[PDB]
Amino acid sequence: EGQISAVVHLVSSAVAGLPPGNVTLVDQSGHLLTQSNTSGRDLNDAQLKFANDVESRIQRRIEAILSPIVGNGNVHAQVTAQLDFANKEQTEE
Amino acid sequence: QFSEQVNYQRALEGELARTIETLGPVKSARVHLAMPSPSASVTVTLEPGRALDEGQISAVVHLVSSAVAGLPPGNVTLVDQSGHLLTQSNTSGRDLNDAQLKFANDVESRIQRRIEAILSPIVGNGNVHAQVTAQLDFANKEQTEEHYSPNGDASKATLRSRQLNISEQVPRSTQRNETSNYEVDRTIRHTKMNVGDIERLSVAVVVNYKLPLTADQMKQIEDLTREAMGFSDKRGDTLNVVNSPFS
Amino acid sequence: QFSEQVNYQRALEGELARTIETLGPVKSARVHLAMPSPSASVTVTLEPGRALDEGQISAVVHLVSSAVAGLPPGNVTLVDQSGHLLTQSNTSGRDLNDAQLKFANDVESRIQRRIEAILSPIVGNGNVHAQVTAQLDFANKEQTEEHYSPNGDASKATLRSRQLNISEQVPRSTQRNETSNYEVDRTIRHTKMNVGDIERLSVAVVVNYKLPLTADQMKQIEDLTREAMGFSDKRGDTLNVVNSPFS
Amino acid sequence: QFSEQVNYQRALEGELARTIETLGPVKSARVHLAMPSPSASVTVTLEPGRALDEGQISAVVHLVSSAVAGLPPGNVTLVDQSGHLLTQSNTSGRDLNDAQLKFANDVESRIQRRIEAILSPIVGNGNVHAQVTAQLDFANKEQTEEHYSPNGDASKATLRSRQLNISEQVPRSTQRNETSNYEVDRTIRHTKMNVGDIERLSVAVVVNYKLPLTADQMKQIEDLTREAMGFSDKRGDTLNVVNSPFS
Numbered sequence: 001e002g003q004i005s006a007v008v009h010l011v012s013s014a015v016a017g018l019p020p021g022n023v024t025l026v027d028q029s030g031h032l033l034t035q036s037n038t039s040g041r042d043l044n045d046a047q048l049k050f051a052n053d054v055e056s057r058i059q060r061r062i063e064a065i066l067s068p069i070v071g072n073g074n075v076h077a078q079v080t081a082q083l084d085f086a087n088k089e090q091t092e093e
Numbered sequence: 094q095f096s097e098q099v100n101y102q103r104a105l106e107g108e109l110a111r112t113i114e115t116l117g118p119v120k121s122a123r124v125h126l127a128m129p130s131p132s133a134s135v136t137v138t139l140e141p142g143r144a145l146d147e148g149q150i151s152a153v154v155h156l157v158s159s160a161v162a163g164l165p166p167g168n169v170t171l172v173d174q175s176g177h178l179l180t181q182s183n184t185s186g187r188d189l190n191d192a193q194l195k196f197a198n199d200v201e202s203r204i205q206r207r208i209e210a211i212l213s214p215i216v217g218n219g220n221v222h223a224q225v226t227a228q229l230d231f232a233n234k235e236q237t238e239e240h241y242s243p244n245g246d247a248s249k250a251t252l253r254s255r256q257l258n259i260s261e262q263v264p265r266s267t268q269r270n271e272t273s274n275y276e277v278d279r280t281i282r283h284t285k286m287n288v289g290d291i292e293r294l295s296v297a298v299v300v301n302y303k304l305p306l307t308a309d310q311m312k313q314i315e316d317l318t319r320e321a322m323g324f325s326d327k328r329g330d331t332l333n334v335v336n337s338p339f340s
Numbered sequence: 341q342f343s344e345q346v347n348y349q350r351a352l353e354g355e356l357a358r359t360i361e362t363l364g365p366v367k368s369a370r371v372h373l374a375m376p377s378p379s380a381s382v383t384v385t386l387e388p389g390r391a392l393d394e395g396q397i398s399a400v401v402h403l404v405s406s407a408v409a410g411l412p413p414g415n416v417t418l419v420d421q422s423g424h425l426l427t428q429s430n431t432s433g434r435d436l437n438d439a440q441l442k443f444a445n446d447v448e449s450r451i452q453r454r455i456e457a458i459l460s461p462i463v464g465n466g467n468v469h470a471q472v473t474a475q476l477d478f479a480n481k482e483q484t485e486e487h488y489s490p491n492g493d494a495s496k497a498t499l500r501s502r503q504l505n506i507s508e509q510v511p512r513s514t515q516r517n518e519t520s521n522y523e524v525d526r527t528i529r530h531t532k533m534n535v536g537d538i539e540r541l542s543v544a545v546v547v548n549y550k551l552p553l554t555a556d557q558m559k560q561i562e563d564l565t566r567e568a569m570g571f572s573d574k575r576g577d578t579l580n581v582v583n584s585p586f587s
Numbered sequence: 588q589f590s591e592q593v594n595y596q597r598a599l600e601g602e603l604a605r606t607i608e609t610l611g612p613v614k615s616a617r618v619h620l621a622m623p624s625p626s627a628s629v630t631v632t633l634e635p636g637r638a639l640d641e642g643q644i645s646a647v648v649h650l651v652s653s654a655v656a657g658l659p660p661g662n663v664t665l666v667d668q669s670g671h672l673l674t675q676s677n678t679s680g681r682d683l684n685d686a687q688l689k690f691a692n693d694v695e696s697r698i699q700r701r702i703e704a705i706l707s708p709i710v711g712n713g714n715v716h717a718q719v720t721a722q723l724d725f726a727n728k729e730q731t732e733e734h735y736s737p738n739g740d741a742s743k744a745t746l747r748s749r750q751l752n753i754s755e756q757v758p759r760s761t762q763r764n765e766t767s768n769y770e771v772d773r774t775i776r777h778t779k780m781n782v783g784d785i786e787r788l789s790v791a792v793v794v795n796y797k798l799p800l801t802a803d804q805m806k807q808i809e810d811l812t813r814e815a816m817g818f819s820d821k822r823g824d825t826l827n828v829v830n831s832p833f834s
Contacts, residue, residue, distance in 0.1 A: 001391060021148060021149060021423075030206055037148055038148070040181075040188075040193075040196070041189070041192040041195075043433040045199055045433075048199055050438060050441075052203070061473060064469070068586045069586070078207045080323035082323055085287040086285060088285075090283075092278075097343065112372070115383070115421070116383070151431070159416070160380070341589065356619055364670070395672060395678065398672050402677035403666050406628040406662050407621055407626070408621050440681075442685075446685060447688065450692070457718055461833045498739075500769055501767065502766075505763070506765075525735055532728075533726050537725075563829070564793070566789075566827075
C-alpha cells in the first residue's frame with residue numbers, strides 16, 4: 001500500500017501541474033490500486049468502495065479456488081455486485 | 094473579557110497556520126476564524142509547482158473545521174496563491190448538483206475497467222475499448238406500504254368480540270343480529286430509497302481485428318461483457334459490441 | 341475562569357501529542373482540540389517511508405477520543421504529513437458498513453481452517469484447498485409472540501366466575517342464561533435475534549490427485565467436510581468437492 | 588476550583604502511570620484521563636519483546652477504571668508502542684458481534700480437546716484428529732408462562748362464594764339460579780434464557796491406521812466420541828468418524 005504512493009509522488013512532482021490525486025494505478029487484472037474519492041456527495045461513493053470490497057473478496061475467492069486446478073495465472077474473474085443500500089424497516093403483526 | 098477571547102483567537106489562528114505549513118507542499122498558510130454562526134477562510138500559498146488534490150482539499154478543510162468548535166466543513170474557504178477558489182462548498186448556486194457528475198464518472202469508470210479487465214486476456218492488452226454511460230437516480234424517495242391480510246373467509250378471520258343474537262318464532266318471523274369485531278394482520282414496510290442507483294446502462298465495446306473474429310468468439314465476448322456490466326433487462330440496459338480494425 | 345481553560349487546553353494538547361509522538365512511526369504530532377459539541381484534529385508526521393495501517397488509525401483515534409470528555413471517535417480528524425485525509429468517518433458514510441466484511445471474512449476463515457485441518461491428515465499437507473462463502477444476516481430483528489391455550493373444552497377451561505340461571509315452566513317455556521368468566525393460560529416470548537448469524541454456506545473443496553482418489557474415499561471426504569461446515573439442509577447449504585490434479 | 592481539579596488530575600495520572608510502569612513487561616506508560624461522562628486513554632510502552640495477554644489487558648483496564656470514580660472499563664483505550672489498538676472494545680462498528688467468534692472458538696476447542704483426550708489413549712498420541720463446529724444461539728430471549736389449573740370438575744374446584752337459589756312450584760315451574768366465584772391455581776414461570784447456548788454440534792473425527800481398525804473398535808470409538816460431545820438427537824447433533832491412513 002505504501003509502495004504505490006512512492007511512485008505516485010515520484011511522477012506527480014517530476015511533471016508540471018500534475019497533482020498526486022490524478023494518477024491512476026491499475027494492476028494486470030483490473031485492481032485499481034489507487035483509491036480516489038470526491039469532495040461532494042462522498043457519502044454516496046463510500047458505497048462504491050463498499051461494492052468494490054464485496055466484489056474484490058468474491059474475486060479473490062474464485063481466483064483462489066481455481067488457481068490450483070488450471071494454474072496460477074490461467075484464470076481471470078470479474079464480479080459485478082448490485083447492492084441494496086435502501087434503509088428498510090418492516091413491522092409484521 | 095473581549096480582549097481575552099480576541100487574544101485566544103488571535104493566537105489560535107497563528108498556531109493553526111503554522112500547523113498547516115508543516116504539511117508537505119504548503120509553503121505558508123493563513124487561517125482566519127470567525128466566532129461570535131461561525132466560519133473560516135484559509136489562504137494557502139502552495140509550493141512552486143504543485144497542486145493540492147481534490148480530496149487533499151478536504152484534508153485541510155476537516156483538520157480546521159474540526160479543530161474549532163461548531164464550524165462545519167462547508168463554511169471553510171480555501172484559496173490558492175493565484176485565485177483558484179478551491180472550495181466549491183462556497184458555490185452559492187448548487188455546490189451539489191454536479192458532485193453527481195463526478196459520481197457518475199466513478200460508476201462508469203469502474204464498469205469500464207471491469208470490461209477492459211475481463212476482455213484484455215482474450216483479445217489482447219490494447220485490442221479492446223469500452224465506454225459506459227450510466228443513468229443514475231438522484232431523486233430522494235421515501236415509501237410507506239401498509240398491507241392487511243384479508244379476513245373475508247371465516248376460517249381465517251380472527252375475532253376479538255362476537256355478539257350473535259338469533260331469534261326464531263314459528264308465519265316464521267326469524268331474526269339474526271350479528272356484531273363482529275376483528276383483529277387484522279398488518280404489515281408496515283417503510284423504505285427510504287438509495288440516492289445514486291443505476292436506472293439504465295448503455296455500453297459500447299470495440300474489439301480489434303486479428304481479420305474478423307469468428308461469430309462464436311464474438312458471441313462469447315458479448316456474453317462476458319453482459320456479465321461484466323451487470324446487464325439487466327429489467328433496467329432496460331443496452332449493449333453493443335462491434336468488431337472493427339483499429340488505426 | 342476563561343484564562344484557566346485556555347491554558348489548560350493549550351497544555352493538555354501538548355501532553356497528549358508528545359505521548360503519541362512516542363509511538364514508533366510518528367516523528368511529530370500536532371493535536372488541536374475544540375471544547376465549549378466537540379472535536380479534535382491530529383497532524384501526525386509519520387517516519388520517512390512508513391504508513392500506519394487502518395486498524396492503526398483506530399488506535400490513535402480512540403486514544404484521543406477517550407482522553408477527552410464527550411468527544412466521540414467520529415469527530416476526530418486524522419491527517420498525515422502529505423494530504424491524505426485518512427479519517428473518512430468525518431464524512432459520515434456508514435463506516436459501519438464494512439465491519440460486516442471483516443466479520444464475514446472471519447466466519448469464512450474459521451470454517452476454512454477447519455476444513456483444511458480435518459483433511460490435511462488424510463490427503464496431505466497441501467493437497468486440499470477450500471473456499472467458503474458465508475451469507476450472513478445482519479438485520480436487526482425483534483419478535484414478540486403471545487400464545488394462549490384454547491379453553492373451548494370444558495374439561496380444561498378455568499373459570500373465575502359463572503352465573504348459571506335455569507328456568508323451566510311446564511307448553512314448555514324453558515330458559516338457560518349462563519355468564520362465564522375465564523382465566524386463560526398465556527405464554528409471552530420476547531426474542532431479540534442475533535445480528536450476524538449464518539443464513540447460508542456454500543463451500544467448494546478441491547483435492548489433489550495421488551491418480552484419481554477412489555469414489556469411496558471421495559464420499560468420506562465429502563462427509564467430513566459436511567461435518568466441518570456445520571452443513572444444514574434447512575439453511576440450504578451447498579457443498580461441492582472435486583478431485584483434480586494440481587499444478 | 589478549576590485549577591484545583593487540573594493539578595489534582597495531573598498528579599493522579601502521573602501517580603497511577605508510575606505504578607503501572609512498575610509491572611514487569613512495561614517500560615513506560617502514559618495514561619490520559621477525561622474528567623469533567625468520562626473516559627481514559629493509557630499508552631503503555633511494553634518492554635522490548637513481550638506482550639500483555641488478553642486477560643492481562645483487563646488487569647490494566649480495571650487498574651485504571653476502578654482507581655477512578657465512575658470510569659467504566661469500556662472507555663479505556665490500550666495502545667501498544669506501534670499503533671496496535673489491543674482492546675477491540677474501542678473500535679466500535681460492532682465490537683460485540685465478533686466476541687461471538689472467539690466464544691464459539693472456545694466452546695469448540697474444549698469439545699475438541701475432550702475428544703482428543705479420550706481417544707489418544709486408545710489409538711495413539713497423534714493418530715486422531717477432531718474438528719468441532721458449534722452453532723450457538725446468541726438471541727436474547729425472555730419467556731413468561733402463566734398456567735392455570737382447570738376447575739371444571741366440581742370435586743377439585745375451589746369456591747370463594749356461591750349463591751344457589753332453587754325455586755320449585757308444583758304445571759311444574761322450577762327455577763335454579765347459581766352464582767359461583769372461584770379461586771384458581773396459578774403458576775407463573777419467568778425464564779430469561781441464556782445467551783450462548785449450543786444449538787447444534789457437528790463433529791468430524793479421523794483416526795489413523797495401524798491396517799483398518801476393526802468394526803468393533805470403530806463402533807466403540809464412535810460411542811466414546813458420542814459421549815465426549817454431549818451428543819443429543821434433540822439438538823440434531825451429527826457425528827462422523829472415518830478411519831483413514833495418515834500421511
